[PDB]
Subunit: 124 residues, 4 copies
């Protein structure tokens, strides 16, 4: 597959999924690349986006919950890595859900290809 | 001007900018629509996205920090508004900054057009 | 896998990849959903986007070439399917490339999930 | 205003709107940066996206037709400007439209800020 997987404790590229809240219909999910091991963020090398998909139990098809783009990577008129502005590849997705299901995150490095990770959403 | 503006206390569409953290230039900015007055999230009427722009003092040009799309609005094979899955129009942008500057947020409702808001980042 | 696949001559959701031109490393790829069999485009039901991926021979990783979002689906203040504006899910990706390689397209329907298709790019 | 405007013949950054065709209720609209004067596409310096807005006669609000991201700028594990893949900042938007209106296009360079262009659609 194009979507690489790995242990996130060992591999900086794996998008890590964290369920911050899941109760009373409302959910809070944080996705982060480089959680254990930081990934570089330079004009030449950076994580560009994270996309979160959720498939409720009982639903034949998955739904994209959202997508986060990280657009600043130090680039300026003075040259690469000079602007002082760097977007950290961490996104928080807030959404309503009526029952439990599966989460999948997709992420992209401009040089190291595509990555995915999976997690259970246990709704209360 | 395409980008509408108003007082977020009385207008549901205004993207509200909140600086949650700014220590040592490590910054986290939350932007949301419907902070004071809620905006609908239905298959037929919803906020689709928020985009954050930061221009540091001394910088000739602004920079886009990030963009957040909210993609679920209840649609399913069984009809509109039946999936139970609705993405809130709230995003948190985390980024490094070494100078104070001007934050500009842009947002889009599928039927009520384009919106903007502003706030100063002070380090 | 999340990314469904099928024969585009019998399944409307399959993103279809056409190499319009590839002369002297100046490439134009059309990608579309609903080429043989039309897909609907209503407020309730539509193709949201297509993303094109290219991996040059000799390259260990693939590169996203582009993404197209199809944002209008008829919604207005007069209700769903009243604006008269509906973006067709057809994109054209124009790019330079030094070598032949593999093309992968991904697309998404707001109620029928995620989809994919593949084609070879020969220079 | 953040959105810069200029004469596209003199200014490489201006997104240029071109109505190609109108057939069977579908309109084709090409947007491109660097038509008259080319813009660079390096790992360091490049146009990242184009977004097209359409507001039909009589509509109180504008609608986003679509957005195109140009994701490849030469970066590889071998360094900047080594992969051979570079996405031209050129997009084609195909959509249905029953009425005339105003076309607005927005675009972004990673170091030269945000840009806008306007054209009329006549149907
Ligand atoms: Fe990487
Ligand atoms: Fe609205
Ligand atoms: Fe569908
Ligand atoms: Fe530029």
């Amino acid at each position: 597959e194009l979507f690489q997987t790995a242990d996130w404790k060992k591999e900086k590229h794996v998008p890590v999924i964290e369920v911050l809240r899941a109760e009373g219909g409302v959910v809070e999910v944080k996705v982060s690349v480089g959680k254990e091991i930081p990934h570089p963020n330079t004009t030449e090398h950076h994580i560009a986006w994270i996309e979160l998909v959720f498939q409720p139990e009982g639903s034949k098809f998955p739904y994209v919950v959202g997508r986060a783009e990280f657009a600043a990577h130090g680039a300026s008129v003075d040259g690469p890595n000079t602007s002082g502005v760097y977007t950290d590849p961490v996104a928080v997705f807030a959404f309503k859900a009526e029952k439990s299901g599966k989460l999948t995150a997709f992420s992209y490095c401009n040089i190291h290809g595509l990555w995915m990770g999976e997690a259970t959403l246990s709704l209360e």
